[PDB]
Amino acid sequence: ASKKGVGSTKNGRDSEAKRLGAKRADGQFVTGGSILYRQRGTKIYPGENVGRGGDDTLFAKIDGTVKFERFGRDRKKVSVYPVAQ
RNA sequence: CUACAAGUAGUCAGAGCCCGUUAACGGGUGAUGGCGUGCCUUUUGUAGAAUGAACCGGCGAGUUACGAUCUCGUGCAAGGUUAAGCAGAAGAUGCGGAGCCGCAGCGAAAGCGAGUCUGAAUAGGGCGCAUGAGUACGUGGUCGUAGACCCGAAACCAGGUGAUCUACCCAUGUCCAGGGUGAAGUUCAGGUAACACUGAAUGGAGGCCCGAACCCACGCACGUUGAAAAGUGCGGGGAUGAGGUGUGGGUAGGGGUGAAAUGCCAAUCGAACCUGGAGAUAGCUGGUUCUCUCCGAAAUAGCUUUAGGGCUAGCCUCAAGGUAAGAGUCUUGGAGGUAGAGCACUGAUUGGACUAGGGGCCGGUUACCGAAUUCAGUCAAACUCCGAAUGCCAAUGACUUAUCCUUGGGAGUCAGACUGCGAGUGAUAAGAUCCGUAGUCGAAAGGGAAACAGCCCAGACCGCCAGCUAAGGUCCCAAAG
RNA sequence: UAAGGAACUCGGCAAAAUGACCCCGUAACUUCGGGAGAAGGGGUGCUCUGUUAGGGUGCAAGCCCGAGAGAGCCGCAGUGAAUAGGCCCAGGCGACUGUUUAGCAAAAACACAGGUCUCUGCGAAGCCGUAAGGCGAAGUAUAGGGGCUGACGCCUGCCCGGUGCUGGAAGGUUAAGAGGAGCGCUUAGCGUAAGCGAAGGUGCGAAUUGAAGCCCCAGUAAACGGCGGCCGUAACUAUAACGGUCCUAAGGUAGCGAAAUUCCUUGUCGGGUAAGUUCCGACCCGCACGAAAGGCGCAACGAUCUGGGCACUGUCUCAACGAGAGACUCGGUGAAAUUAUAGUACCUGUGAAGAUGCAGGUUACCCGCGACAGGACGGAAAGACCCCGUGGAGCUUUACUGCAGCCUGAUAUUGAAUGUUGGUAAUUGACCUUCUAACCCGCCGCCCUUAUCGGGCGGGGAGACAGUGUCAGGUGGGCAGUUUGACUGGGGCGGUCGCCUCCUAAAAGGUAACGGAGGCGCCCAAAGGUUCCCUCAGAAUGGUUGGAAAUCAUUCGCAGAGUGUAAAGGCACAAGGGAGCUUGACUGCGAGACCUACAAGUCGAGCAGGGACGAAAGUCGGGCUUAGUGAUCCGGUGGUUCCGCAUGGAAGGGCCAUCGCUCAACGGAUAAAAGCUACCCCGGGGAUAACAGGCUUAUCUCCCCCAAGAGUCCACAUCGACGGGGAGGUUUGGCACCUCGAUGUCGGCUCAUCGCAUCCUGGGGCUGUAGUCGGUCCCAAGGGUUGGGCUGUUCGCCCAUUAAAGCGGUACGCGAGCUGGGUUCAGAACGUCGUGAGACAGUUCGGUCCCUAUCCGUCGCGGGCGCAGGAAAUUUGAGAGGAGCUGUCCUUAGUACGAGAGGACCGGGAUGGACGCACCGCUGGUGUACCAGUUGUUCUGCCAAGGGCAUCGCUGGGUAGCUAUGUGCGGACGGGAUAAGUGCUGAAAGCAUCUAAGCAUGAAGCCCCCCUCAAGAUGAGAUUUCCCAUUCCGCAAGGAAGUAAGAUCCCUGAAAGAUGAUCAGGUUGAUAGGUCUGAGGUGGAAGUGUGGCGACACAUGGAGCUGACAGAUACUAAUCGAUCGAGGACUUAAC
RNA sequence: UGGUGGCGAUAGCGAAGAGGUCACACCCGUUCCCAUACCGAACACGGAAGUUAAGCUCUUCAGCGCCGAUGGUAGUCGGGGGUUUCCCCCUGUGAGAGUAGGACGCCGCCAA
RNA sequence: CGGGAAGUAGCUCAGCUUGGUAGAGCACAUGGUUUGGGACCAUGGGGUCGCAGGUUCGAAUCCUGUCUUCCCGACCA
RNA sequence: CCUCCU
Ligand SMILES: [K+]
Ligand SMILES: [K+]
Ligand SMILES: [K+]
Ligand SMILES: [K+]
Ligand SMILES: [K+]
Ligand SMILES: [K+]
Ligand SMILES: [K+]
Ligand SMILES: [K+]
Ligand SMILES: [K+]
Ligand SMILES: [K+]
Ligand SMILES: [K+]
Ligand SMILES: [K+]
Ligand SMILES: [K+]
Ligand SMILES: [K+]
Ligand SMILES: [K+]
Ligand SMILES: [K+]
Ligand SMILES: [K+]
Ligand SMILES: [K+]
Ligand SMILES: [K+]
Ligand SMILES: [K+]
Ligand SMILES: [K+]
Ligand SMILES: [K+]
Ligand SMILES: [K+]
Ligand SMILES: [Mg+2]
Ligand SMILES: [Mg+2]
Ligand SMILES: [Mg+2]
Ligand SMILES: [Mg+2]
Ligand SMILES: [Mg+2]
Ligand SMILES: [Mg+2]
Ligand SMILES: [Mg+2]
Ligand SMILES: [Mg+2]
Ligand SMILES: [Mg+2]
Ligand SMILES: [Mg+2]
Ligand SMILES: [Mg+2]
Ligand SMILES: [Mg+2]
Ligand SMILES: [Mg+2]
Ligand SMILES: [Mg+2]
Ligand SMILES: [Mg+2]
Ligand SMILES: [Mg+2]
Ligand SMILES: [Mg+2]
Ligand SMILES: [Mg+2]
Ligand SMILES: [Mg+2]
Ligand SMILES: [Mg+2]
Ligand SMILES: [Mg+2]
Ligand SMILES: [Mg+2]
Ligand SMILES: [Mg+2]
Ligand SMILES: [Mg+2]
Ligand SMILES: [Mg+2]
Ligand SMILES: [Mg+2]
Ligand SMILES: [Mg+2]
Ligand SMILES: [Mg+2]
Ligand SMILES: [Mg+2]
Ligand SMILES: [Mg+2]
Ligand SMILES: [Mg+2]
Ligand SMILES: [Mg+2]
Ligand SMILES: [Mg+2]
Ligand SMILES: [Mg+2]
Ligand SMILES: [Mg+2]
Ligand SMILES: [Mg+2]
Ligand SMILES: [Mg+2]
Ligand SMILES: [Mg+2]
Ligand SMILES: [Mg+2]
Ligand SMILES: [Mg+2]
Ligand SMILES: [Mg+2]
Ligand SMILES: [Mg+2]
Ligand SMILES: [Mg+2]
Ligand SMILES: [Mg+2]
Ligand SMILES: [Mg+2]
Ligand SMILES: [Mg+2]
Ligand SMILES: [Mg+2]
Ligand SMILES: [Mg+2]
Ligand SMILES: [Mg+2]
Ligand SMILES: [Mg+2]
Ligand SMILES: [Mg+2]
Ligand SMILES: [Mg+2]
Ligand SMILES: [Mg+2]
Ligand SMILES: [Mg+2]
Ligand SMILES: [Mg+2]
Ligand SMILES: [Mg+2]
Ligand SMILES: [Mg+2]
Ligand SMILES: [Mg+2]
Ligand SMILES: [Mg+2]
Ligand SMILES: [Mg+2]
Ligand SMILES: [Mg+2]
Ligand SMILES: [Mg+2]
Ligand SMILES: [Mg+2]
Ligand SMILES: [Mg+2]
Ligand SMILES: [Mg+2]
Ligand SMILES: [Mg+2]
Ligand SMILES: [Mg+2]
Ligand SMILES: [Mg+2]
Ligand SMILES: [Mg+2]
Ligand SMILES: [Mg+2]
Ligand SMILES: [Mg+2]
Ligand SMILES: [Mg+2]
Ligand SMILES: [Mg+2]
Ligand SMILES: [Mg+2]
Ligand SMILES: [Mg+2]
Ligand SMILES: [Mg+2]
Ligand SMILES: [Mg+2]
Ligand SMILES: [Mg+2]
Ligand SMILES: [Mg+2]
Ligand SMILES: [Mg+2]
Ligand SMILES: [Mg+2]
Ligand SMILES: [Mg+2]
Ligand SMILES: [Mg+2]
Ligand SMILES: [Mg+2]
Ligand SMILES: [Mg+2]
Ligand SMILES: [Mg+2]
Ligand SMILES: [Mg+2]
Ligand SMILES: [Mg+2]
Secondary structure: OOOOOOOOOOOOOOOOOOOOOOOOOOOOOEOOOOOOEEEEOOOEEEEEEEEEEEOOEEOOOOOEEEEEEEEEOOEEEEEEOOOOO
16 A cells, blocks of 8 residues: 655744733732733733833732723723722 | 244233242243343443353452551540560560650751841841640551562573484494496507507496485375374485494583574574573553442643653542632623724735836837826735624622532543534545534433434433323324324 | 367476387587487287207206297287386576475575685694683694685776775874872961961872874775766768766776666567567667676586477366265264354344344244355464564664773883993983893603603703783774664654744633744843933935935925844834933842742832932833743852861861753753664554555546537537536545454456446437448347467457457455465575665565364255145146347348449348257267286196286277267247337417327337246145044043054165155065076187197187166065054034 | 813814914024034023014814714524525624714813 | 755856855957968957845845756555 | 868
8 A cells, every 4th residue: 555755844833822911800909019911012001000010011019909991092001099998 | 832933032011821839919831012232351432243251160369567648546645655675374464764756946057946047137038936736556548668459471690401303523333126338547459760649359437327225305186183293195306425324422502513594402493491580570461259328530731762651730539627718690890803894004906097117119109018196896814994792800789509718538530432613634525633612422221313322302219000291203013183 | 088189277287198128320519528318210929940040057968048030820909917218499597416494495595626815834823611621733834724706618807095904113192000390288386366387197290201003104906895977079860989078096898788687668679479578589778787795608417497399198178987085874982173142034224334133124834964165254373464562582783881802011920141322420211132040841851650641850942031910001793781762644764852923723811733934042241221312114306426226405204114133012202213421231139929730930019238320200130022041960160157077177068159961852761872683572452554344535437517619511410628517436545433362465266146337139319320331329237248379467468259359346256165376474596775784565486275064044855743634646826946148141132222332121031159958869988797809927736718916907899877079959939018219199388299188109128928946825725536433531621542545664676866755666566686588798708620830720600708778587585564544623604 | 371281183184364562482692501423403591673474372164084873784692493615593792884973172270 | 756956158067055256167259370270379258147036235145936957765565 | 180072
């Protein structure tokens, strides 16, 4: 039984998935430090009491409630507001 | 009971006949009717045209020791406990405190100590304390070291036994009916100056010829649970030789011997045989024995000289805790770029208008192509000016439901299958392959789809000669139009 | 064994033929021997002459051997039986006789004589052994060992670059051992401390010295090996003697060549054949010949291989008969493999995808006996193939690591002199030479001593060498232990392996494939930090050089740019551009998060220390973000309020910092690793390949749609592009679902059976159908469908036929049916590849084919019971099987048709081929209890006549029976209904219209007709005839007994037969034997006579003899017996 | 008017007008602080002769851009069916495009 | 079918690996030399690197595709 | 080194 020779692919590579995106929900309580969003670039901007890390990670600078919110016409931010106290 | 019957041999229904018991809504037999593809192993899936068992009987597989750890029990408890040994029934027990564990941790260590280490630090942080139980013994679960659940290699090494078979050799014997051919040499004759050379006779060479014994083994047939573990029959080859054969001897296994085939070395040879190391090792195959109950998987991820193995995680179970932390639905908020769609970007692309420019044809002209621009029009996994349904993450109560988490003991699983839906690979093939998602099978019997793991309906604790329905059905087989 | 004679087959395998002696005669070729038993022919008994000639023995007598003749005699035949070469032509291979895989290979393999290379000066080399001791060899270069080649003949070219071997040693490099310049630790002592530091001890240690080897220089190919491209060129073309150029150590000479080598390939041409994939001869595009792994020849030789002839034949056409051994029946004895239990049908389907057992149907009374193998994926053997195992073993090597051996140095044993030449002016190393006294002697004499051992003594030789010990370097598949990855739509081979980005990815996250695309293993001292300022691509227009595009100016300008680098996400309050100052490209950390099996990975506000920039606010722990990397162990370097084995130190460790991995197979097995196995083995797998099956149908085969064209015209007679749609499931595949505790695998043979897509024959439509022929389509599966050459072949080509030479399925139908050529083990060889061991759907020569049938199934044959009494016959036919083919000639008619050429339908008739049934009168075959001839020997005493054995001894005939090649006969003639087709009438639809109502016609096909079986046809049928209603038990229901008609046991047998069965008979009986008479067969008995010297001939006499054949005849045997076998249920209806 | 904010361009472009004592500009200088990879252009320091031409402020406008329903349609969760590369049905949900329409600014605080 | 290697002037070859320059021999052309050829001497010219696309400021050179011509492989069944 | 044919 004859078997035709076959070629090869020059593809077959991919990097590890980086588990990007939202890490806390709108309206969820977070502690200071909590990563809110992982991203390349600013898909979402740091709002009130939120920071942008060296790799564009958005994180809560205080304890409080996460609010994702429209930032002008085209953009989005995420903010953390203190609880009513 | 049985000669018109289609048989995993029963089971349920059932006359007839024959009986009469541990006296029971009894026993034997069984015309006929319905249903019904053994058991085990291994599998995605086995009635399997895969595996195992002729039958019956007996025998035949998680053990024990010493350590570790957990649960349970008991004694004592900030303590607990003795070992060897001595005495004593091979005993209990008494003595024996050496030793061991615990009561304090932190640090690599010096060391400090309810703290300590890091650090320049009264900082912060790590591990501890505060947040207190151990220890001795026993049973049980599991682990470790031992053959460690049982059976099974091919092999490896050590020490031996074999050349009464066979290989070659050594010493010493012996065998080979018959027939043929006619080398050298010699003689004689011829022959020449001598020799050459010629003829005839003689002579008896030879891994010479034909052919019995003997040895061999070329062809065919037969035989193939044989007359025979290599033969017989008919033919065949050698048959004075590198011959056959007897007796007595020699060479021995990491070795001999080989006119060389890895041949032969006692029916064994790519390394003999026997015993031992030895219960070698086997991530492999097979097997692993009483019952019922409660619960009940996986066939995945990651890493692996890894891919049919393993480990951690996932999923199961048991206990103790926490406890109500889980889940469904409604409501509310949010992240996100798929389906669709669109052309705003990138790329592809059709027609018209339009010409820069190029090409045929004279700085001049053409049915030849044309960039841009413009009008209209198509398309896209790696296009997006847009953008759902769902799914996901949460919050908030409400209505409902009972899960959920932690710690510890014990696993198994890492071959999956098909079906529907969304993709890739393929040829928009495969009962194909590879993901995603739901189901069923696996591990699920019952009804339907003739039969038919995976489809449709539906989850078997038992009994009933009750009833209602599901899918699918209602002329007869075959319940109901 | 008729006729034939290789047609058989892979192949003349097997068989047949040949065969003794004497004589004649005998070719090519040759190594002059051979070839040769070449070939091809002739003779062959017996009698007499004849106790021949002649010979041996002997005094003779005699005995023995014995040609060659002549004359006869007999037979079918005289080596009368048994035993006893077939031969020839040509080629390959090996020169030859030998040898070999005990037990699948006898060969082309091995050996061989011969050649050559090479080593070896004798304690030889080589080999065995640790050594002693040995072999070598009681040999000595004309000898011995090793490698290669393989008689003989002619020959044996080129390359020394590589590798090996040999020689060389000027230099380089290199060990132990010498050597000890320095340095460290320690501490007497000295120092307020810090430090310094004598001596000693101790730990390191540089220069220098140091052999062989290696590098290096040469040589060597009958050492290992190797021995080229491209382009141009001649006055026809073609080809290029000739030239150019690149490369090499050198480019393959002679010879041979489609080959044991040639893929393409059945090369081409010639020969041989009717036909030749093989064979021989040529040619040369030598895939991939080639000169001692020899080249080319070659007489002789071969159980060698190949091709062709003569002879010969049962090899075959195509089979028939006979003998014996089994088989079969009876008596005796009596295993085995296998086995889940089996009351064990068929079809189609289903299903783990190929069912006795499942479904639905169809069929089937119960039990055997002889037979056959289709199935039980039959038995046998835990598949040798293939894969897998971090399983083995054997083998290889420039795999790794070792070891033996060998070489080389140092040092000990080991001493004495002499010069010479290096540090050190007198002391120590190196070197050369000499000595003798160690050591050695496989030298001599003497002694122990009857001794080729050993020892002693004395000579001689050699000599501080050698040998040996220790240490060291080199060499070293000679030997040893091992390694030699995984993924993978089987494995190998190719590719890949970690990290980053995108898509696939189904709008969270995640998500596979040997899916689709790309990047990375860095870079930057600014391309980092901060402060301040800024805006890009491109276009248009103007303008020196200057263009399409340099720099300048204006205008337009969400970015069409840029962002170190891939991509994505981002970025114009810039994250893009510019400038100033800087080093936060910080140290200690770090609430809390993300990610996650772990190990790791990511983000982080904030705190402290000390800074950079900024007036300040503030920002800064590298870079727009996301790659740019690697665990542990081990080791190095720096630091250190740590440890420091009595103490002080130190050595060494710890801790912090940091360095060394294409550990890239990137979670890294080791510091250190490649191959072959067809000599292979074990554990496993249908988890995974090869055969067959299944799914699929790309490919394949077939059929269609559209209709552009072709066809003068004309798409559609015929063909049909571009495109489109299917069917089938015979191809190659894809997939990997059954089977690896075995599903034997190509072709052929034997036996078929099915489909129809039809090859022929039958029936038709259309035709570019005049006729005869055809083309094309439709119906049709009844029957039929050849023998050869070549090749293992399927296929194909060819020869010759034929009505035709169909295509497919059935596990590529059929190996428990056969074969075994091929494929597919072990041997050997060629080309080729490989350093090698070895390897090749390349080739070549050779190479073990097991099984007693249980079940179903198939073919035959019995027994049982049934079929409302028991019997004997004859039957109907539900139903089943069989058969089913076709040519040629004559005639119609040279008619129809046609210019002619040619030449029919339809219809008559005759006769064949192939096939089948029966049968032996005919022709033949066979004919083992028939007749005859004949050889040898042996027996019946001898002669004569006979018997036995030699294949039935052989040879010539042959009866019955059984038989084909022999004879006879068959498929005839028709009905019925139909297919395609043709219609008639006829409307729907005023017409038309084969159809809707109605009515026909019409195939080798369907149902009959013809032949056979058939009532288990459980639906058990019918007709005719026979027996006759018994007895006893019983309430009857039943039961028992003896019988009738009839049958059987037993017996004689054959027309029957494995056995049963069947049939003819069983005494008023011709059943068989015998007997008698015949037929046929043989061919002329014995005895006697006559003739002849005799072998023999003739007569008596178509005699004698004669299995199975015919008739007759109770002479013999079928004796006497016994056994079995009805008394007929009930109901209803008509009588 | 000026400053300074918040709100998705409904705020923007573009077009046509109107306005300036003060305020905001342009404007006029380079002695000084400071400045230009050259340039007092800009930045900086100073001034007030001029001017609303431009910026700025205020009107008007729907050409471009922006915002944008309702209905319908595509798609689709769930449930069924079929002639199954795909399609249909039913209770939900529901775009994009297109369009009606909106829109040439809305809301602060301070100073004058 | 799978894997390689080439492709540069008329012909044969370098250059490619390292991006910036198109070389070399023979041939060709012109002159000289010769009675005339040949040889010899002197002096010149000739591609845009197979084709297409890409990366780059820039491609014979780096990347891809394609075409042509060679070479190797196609094993176990 | 060569020197077309008659
Ligand atoms: K039953
Ligand atoms: K099996
Ligand atoms: K602390
Ligand atoms: K306790
Ligand atoms: K155990
Ligand atoms: K051996
Ligand atoms: K699925
Ligand atoms: K041999
Ligand atoms: K032949
Ligand atoms: K021969
Ligand atoms: K099965
Ligand atoms: K059978
Ligand atoms: K496959
Ligand atoms: K690895
Ligand atoms: K098969
Ligand atoms: K069709
Ligand atoms: K198998
Ligand atoms: K067989
Ligand atoms: K069989
Ligand atoms: K059976
Ligand atoms: K006859
Ligand atoms: K009957
Ligand atoms: K007579
Ligand atoms: Mg095949
Ligand atoms: Mg960074
Ligand atoms: Mg019946
Ligand atoms: Mg019955
Ligand atoms: Mg059935
Ligand atoms: Mg399976
Ligand atoms: Mg098994
Ligand atoms: Mg069994
Ligand atoms: Mg060993
Ligand atoms: Mg012995
Ligand atoms: Mg002996
Ligand atoms: Mg002889
Ligand atoms: Mg002989
Ligand atoms: Mg014999
Ligand atoms: Mg043996
Ligand atoms: Mg052991
Ligand atoms: Mg449960
Ligand atoms: Mg394994
Ligand atoms: Mg686990
Ligand atoms: Mg779409
Ligand atoms: Mg799966
Ligand atoms: Mg599948
Ligand atoms: Mg399972
Ligand atoms: Mg079920
Ligand atoms: Mg059922
Ligand atoms: Mg099951
Ligand atoms: Mg009913
Ligand atoms: Mg004959
Ligand atoms: Mg004859
Ligand atoms: Mg033949
Ligand atoms: Mg034949
Ligand atoms: Mg023969
Ligand atoms: Mg020979
Ligand atoms: Mg011989
Ligand atoms: Mg043998
Ligand atoms: Mg032998
Ligand atoms: Mg043999
Ligand atoms: Mg010796
Ligand atoms: Mg000797
Ligand atoms: Mg040889
Ligand atoms: Mg030879
Ligand atoms: Mg030579
Ligand atoms: Mg050769
Ligand atoms: Mg040679
Ligand atoms: Mg089943
Ligand atoms: Mg099926
Ligand atoms: Mg079936
Ligand atoms: Mg079975
Ligand atoms: Mg079997
Ligand atoms: Mg079986
Ligand atoms: Mg096996
Ligand atoms: Mg084998
Ligand atoms: Mg080895
Ligand atoms: Mg070992
Ligand atoms: Mg593998
Ligand atoms: Mg593969
Ligand atoms: Mg590879
Ligand atoms: Mg999703
Ligand atoms: Mg996602
Ligand atoms: Mg280690
Ligand atoms: Mg000390
Ligand atoms: Mg790895
Ligand atoms: Mg590893
Ligand atoms: Mg071999
Ligand atoms: Mg061998
Ligand atoms: Mg095996
Ligand atoms: Mg399978
Ligand atoms: Mg197959
Ligand atoms: Mg099968
Ligand atoms: Mg699969
Ligand atoms: Mg089996
Ligand atoms: Mg047909
Ligand atoms: Mg096939
Ligand atoms: Mg077959
Ligand atoms: Mg068979
Ligand atoms: Mg064979
Ligand atoms: Mg070679
Ligand atoms: Mg092979
Ligand atoms: Mg080959
Ligand atoms: Mg009938
Ligand atoms: Mg007769
Ligand atoms: Mg006859
Ligand atoms: Mg006589
Ligand atoms: Mg006798
Ligand atoms: Mg005798
Ligand atoms: Mg009857
Ligand atoms: Mg008689
Ligand atoms: Mg809308």
